């Protein structure tokens, strides 16, 4: 949601089986 948050990298292990930056929360 944040325009420029932390965007810490986080691979979708279980929910979404896809890697993606955890910008929101």
UniProtKB/Swiss-Prot annotation:
Organism: Homo sapiens
Annotated S-S bridges: 7-23, 10-13, 11-19, 14-22
Transmembrane segments: none
Superkingdom classification of source: Eukaryota
Name recorded for this polypeptide: Hepcidin-25
């Amino acid at each position: 949601d944040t325009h420029f948050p932390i965007c810490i990298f986080c691979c979708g292990c279980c929910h979404r089986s896809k890697c993606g930056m955890c910008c929101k929360t």
